[PDB]
């Protein structure tokens, strides 16, 4: 239960009400400052993690790299549960078509987390949460993806999509 | 104390809610359709399948399909989805956080109610779980104790005659007839007066129609002859498009299959004759309460006439000594969901439950083990 | 992508510009001229064909060719140099850079789709484009997503009913009449008034009277009986040459021959009648909305009093039992852009291009399978 994000120790890192404008290695369109491609970044690390992180039922929160983490965490529960028995093609089209859908945001009623994010400051802040949101769900989907079929084409891994049943912290978008 | 949820999966409709509430907070049909166009249409989120009361109103482009055939199921991954369905747009409680209560019919496969446990355990997850009959909740929702249940929903109609507690297993008589072959019939006979009703749609607008323009004639020869001078009989019904029907003999010759099974082709007695045969069935001495106990139950007795017709018959079959009663309580619609919740909220059915570590360690064997 | 240019391939004219905007940054009649004449006085660079606003106003000595007859596309050298005008000499835009967006008329043959793609992929080297029928530019334009849209051009008048987020291909029906043939008829019956118009400038100039004169006829007999006593219905009109001119009934006796196409010697119903058919060979529910949504587009629908016409012949058809309402917005003329426009800044839009990179295997071909 005390795996966190590498990136909680950050300094000087922007952020949006209380989520961290971490960086992103990704070639969608985005606010996300270009990290460096020799590293082990936000979204490789979320999905290498997911595996044992969803097993754990109780999370202790340390900073706003923590509520990306969760983020990534619940988006990729919800991938696993789409993408279940498709192929390879259908899985990009219905996976980015599921992630550019107008979703729900901390401060929103639809939101399930409110209580541990808080609200945008500024219409101007809630506009570049909703860019930043898009571009992280968007380059995390692509690199699940990319992982999930690292053996074959045609099938999703069976062992990769066995947890798409596992509901993790009972809570997620 | 100790709610449970109360899932009576009947085959037209899907009647769910808690242990103990009055009448069942969840009621919508089973139908499970995708759509059949290509839709280049694009936006909006549409959906791969619409389950209930959304299918119901997308109906117009949807390809709806039962996912259970005179209660038998055929569809299990459509009725794995009904369910998802009905535990959480519907009723808006976890699974694993209260036990549920099933019924199925008399006489069913077995492998039908093995598997219902199974993914009811190993997919939801739910603590404890029960499969009862629809008669015997029936006769809890009667408030009596003896008597003959006869039960007809919209898959199958099947009658339990029940003594003091104790319940005859050789005495269950089983007839395939119900409201969907009804249904089907009145399709068929409305073709012969002009209108033509074909696809899924509008097999769904000929049920509406006999959901409100049909009833069972006290006598049927009679009233076939005076419809000869069709003043008082026929009525018209407004088409969903805004063309009007008129149906005459039509209102009464659909429900009288029920009486008559040979109207569909079929060799057996209709309802009224099998309760007899039934009764004659059990010993000689218990026929007599069983005669003056006769507990009408499901969705199709709720036809505007049906229980003055049945005591008739079984009046003119039976002995003329005793009496012969028949029970038509006004919410009959809802009797097997309301004997459920009565019989969840009781102190002596905790022991009977089938607990989710004795399902583990026992397999899926255990509710032939203990539930009959 | 910085952009991305829309190009409303119109029958008669051409509507062209940038996505997320509404303002047409180029409309001009899809003309090519070749002059007639020896031309004596020499200087200045006398090219060899005009197009656009230029052949418009130099019609007097030459000879107008549409390239396009019925929404099908036959002069297909005329029709790249008008392509290469609107890239270069109307938006002043590279296209080699920017994704575009062509607009298609509904059952059209495929051989012109493959022929039109192929042609804008090799000739103008561009990413990607998307061909879809305007009828769905049309119901974006009304901001609606259900209802059947009537799209009345230049070439083609075509009906498509769209239920919520699906269409149905097989109610899909097109009709060869529209506005060319209309004022073909007009310049026809003009001649009983003793007026001579046939050569093509001649023809521009009847298909400006009918654009700033003609109206629909509300009742058609009763119009007559007043039209009798022909007083106040009498207009009048100049001509570029400068005498003047005066048009009595023949004012709405033209566009008339939309609901009387008998007018004209076709067989087939009038626009009203084949819309009512095409709804009802819609399925039985999904005809609520399609009385209620009647999308109409394209400039031919924009005769002062189509609306309320084409209002009471619906409601005269249709039973009375429900209401049928038109939808025309005021910016009738350019809809189909705007729902292009629309459709081309949807985020969802962005990944159902057809590229140059998956045409480089595929072909010319990958078309009817990536847009249908
Ligand atoms: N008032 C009514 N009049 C006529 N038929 C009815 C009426 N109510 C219900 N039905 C019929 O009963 C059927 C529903 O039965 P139901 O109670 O769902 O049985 P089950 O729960 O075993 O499926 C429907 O198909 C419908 O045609
Ligand atoms: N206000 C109007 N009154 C009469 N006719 C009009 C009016 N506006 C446009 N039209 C007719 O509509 C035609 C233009 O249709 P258009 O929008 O180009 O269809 P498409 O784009 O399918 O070619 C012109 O030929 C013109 O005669
Ligand atoms: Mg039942
Ligand atoms: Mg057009």
Redesign the interface.
Known sequence: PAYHSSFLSLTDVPTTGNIAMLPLKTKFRGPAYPADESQMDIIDECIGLFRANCFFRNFEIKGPADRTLIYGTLFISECLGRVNGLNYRDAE?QL??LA??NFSIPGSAGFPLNALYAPPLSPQDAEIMRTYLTQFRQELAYRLLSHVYATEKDHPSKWWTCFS?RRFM?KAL | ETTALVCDNGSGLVKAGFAGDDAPRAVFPSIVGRPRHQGVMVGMGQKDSYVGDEAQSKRGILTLKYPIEHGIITNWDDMEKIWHHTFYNELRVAPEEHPTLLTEAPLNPKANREKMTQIMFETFNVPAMYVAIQAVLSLYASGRTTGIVLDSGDGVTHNVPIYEGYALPHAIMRLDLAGRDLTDYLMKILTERGYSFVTTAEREIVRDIKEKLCYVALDFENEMATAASSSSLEKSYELPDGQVITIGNERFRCPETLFQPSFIGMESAGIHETTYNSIMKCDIDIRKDLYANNVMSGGTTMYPGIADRMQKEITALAPSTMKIKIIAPPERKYSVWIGGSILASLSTFQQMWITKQEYDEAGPSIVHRKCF
């Open positions: 089209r980015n078509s550019l859908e049943k009972n």
